[model samples]
Target: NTPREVTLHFLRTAGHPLTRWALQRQPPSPKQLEEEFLKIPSNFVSPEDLDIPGHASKDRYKTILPNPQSRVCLGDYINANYIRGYDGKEKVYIATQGPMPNTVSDFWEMVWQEEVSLIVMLTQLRVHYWPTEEETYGPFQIRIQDMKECPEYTVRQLTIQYQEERRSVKHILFSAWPDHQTPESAGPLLRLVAEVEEGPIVVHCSAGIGRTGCFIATRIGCQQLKARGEVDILGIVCQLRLDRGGMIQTAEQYQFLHHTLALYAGQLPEEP
Candidate 1:
């Protein structure tokens, strides 16, 4: 048996300017959009392809699978995968399915093991998987040391302990959206997006596809708009799908992304 090793991560330190980067582009022709999406590579990993036997039961969706090359390998099997940030930087974000009622501990365990600095949750009606004050999750002891509430999001200062080691983690949740719908406005999601100070974070939801894809696409889309005064929604979606299968998972979600980015773009200073 080989010795277990914790996956390592690096800080994501790129910032694109929003005022200059606000985008204004007609989404490509609908047919072109479909052609690119259909062109996305699906590195689908079957349950049998998973290293840990019987771990398929933990997956939230039977078809929503991880790309084997980038799946998180843990003492506990997590239906999570590594994702890239702009400029080809590696491992800036770890996207996973929402913490299952049965696989909660695996979420905490890897969060601690990977030295994650942030956990960005973007959905509603999820099973409880976090500690209010303090609790143990398999191999890690999770404690919420502080709580801060904002108009758009709630922040939790988390302390994670494993054996003699202790580390700090942040659990930031963005809500205030209506039930069974994507937000028509961009302020709250942008409010949550622009609040991050560091990297190597975790982002997920029910199946870890739709809003997860929207949020990631929105974040990078904003960054690109800020950095270049323009952003590529289709290209960003393809990048996300390249990392995890079916990331931008809906027509509305795809539409929401453009509307959101365009909303942010309008705020930028226009050249004379």
Candidate 2:
């Protein structure tokens, strides 16, 4: 009885060039890939798991709630979660739903609090609330410094001000998809994962899980493909859902993640 039970788990990471090389040469087949997608434990979180009280007025989707363990609580209510990286880096990204009309100010407040410098919006639909040249949302003054349009996306350099403090953020809208499905290919999404500066980049879509998951997964998977060669779409998705439920919401989206990683893997120069 004195010797009850004890255990420990250890983790370590090192370069696996051949592991990367073999995976690069012969990546996971489509059949096995689908199986891996199916294997993800149903990314379901009970209401008890969220246990966020009095925040329903702020939640965009009633069911798409954040896991409290990683939920961002900045002395205000906002529907968002902090998704860590594969290396366990904290808050690699903050995923949230489209800011509801009432929560727009709350959204800006969060950005100002987190000192987030970048915003990536995956939804194509426009929110009339987006400031034109310059506008104020509550106490925040947002001025569009410049607007650049690419074939697949639009970039806006904006200066956000609160009272006397002024800070800037880049807003990128990647609107390459046609209606309610994945993009025709992974080219544009991969390009996006490449260009965004590393930090607490805030990402969002309408519901915030489907397209948002695909975007975050691509970022994490791309880095793994470079550092270790082989990618873990399944593991990455699971990690994301652990923070926010229903990430990579569909099997097709999961497949798109793998395809995106595969595309990036091909881009890395080969060394024999």
Candidate 3:
């Protein structure tokens, strides 16, 4: 391990090769990004690949599997994956698809079982699955307490009420991220990541790969920046795909990742 002061100095130094690699490297062209993206092993896990039933074709991936030994089990499974953060920390974050109505209960079960502290949503619920009075999902009744609105996202403080058990989770929802598209700027997304000081921070988009990958990649890239004075856009994306295929789904999204990381590098404090 390196000393914190030394790490900080390495990060802030302007002329180092590693620091310059992240801050001033030439952006990869779309063709090159795609070629590299496709070369990575996906290691995809599908519903048919498991013993579970009722998973929709679109939502079958075993990136994150609920432990069968947990306190609750309803054939528990979700198309989620545990993603490691900087320095190989376990379960620092989770990436999953938006829950279908049928999977909502299982989703909550996994949340409660895993004790998730924050949830980041990249799409709106196109279904009418929002909880109403006494409509308990899994072991908890959800109460939407307040919503703070911003130009690009909405933050909701929700109370999860289980029998004699209570917990709160912050939900940051960003609907402006259109399908197969990236945000115009990374400022709002960076701010969202800053709010979640810890995890398991659950993240999802519709299919839980495209925008989800971009967000996770951006966060990991930033983590790399702070820890080692460098970022690995390609390495991070490759690792994410190994966990769940089709992550950062499109070539355009891959391009966007590079742009976002560059923007983040520019915003960091420089050497005095």
Which segments of model 2 are wrong by more than 4 Å? 1-25, 125-129, 178-180, 269-272
What tens-digit string does per-residue lDDT give for candidate 3 at 64-114?
Answer: 332222112333446677776765577777787788777787777767777
Q: Which candidate, 1 or 3, has the higher lDDT?
A: 1
Candidate 1 runs further than 4 Å off: 1-52, 177-181, 268-272
Clashes of 2: 0
Q: Please give the ranking of all candidate structures by lDDT, highest first, separated by commas.
A: 2, 1, 3
Task: State the lDDT of candidate 2 residue by residue for 1-272, as single tens digits.
Answer: 22111100100211222245545567667676677666565444566666657888887667778877788887667889898886778987999988989889889988988888999989664354468898888889899999999878888889999989998899998887543379988888877876684358899988788899889988988888788766766567767867787787777777677667767888877787
Lowest summed lDDT over 10 consecutive residues: which window, candidate 2?
A: 4-13
Best by lDDT: 2
Q: lDDT winner between 2 and 3, please give it.
A: 2
TM for every model, in the order presented, reads 0.81, 0.86, 0.79
- CA lDDT of every candidate: 0.72, 0.76, 0.67
TM-score of 3: 0.79
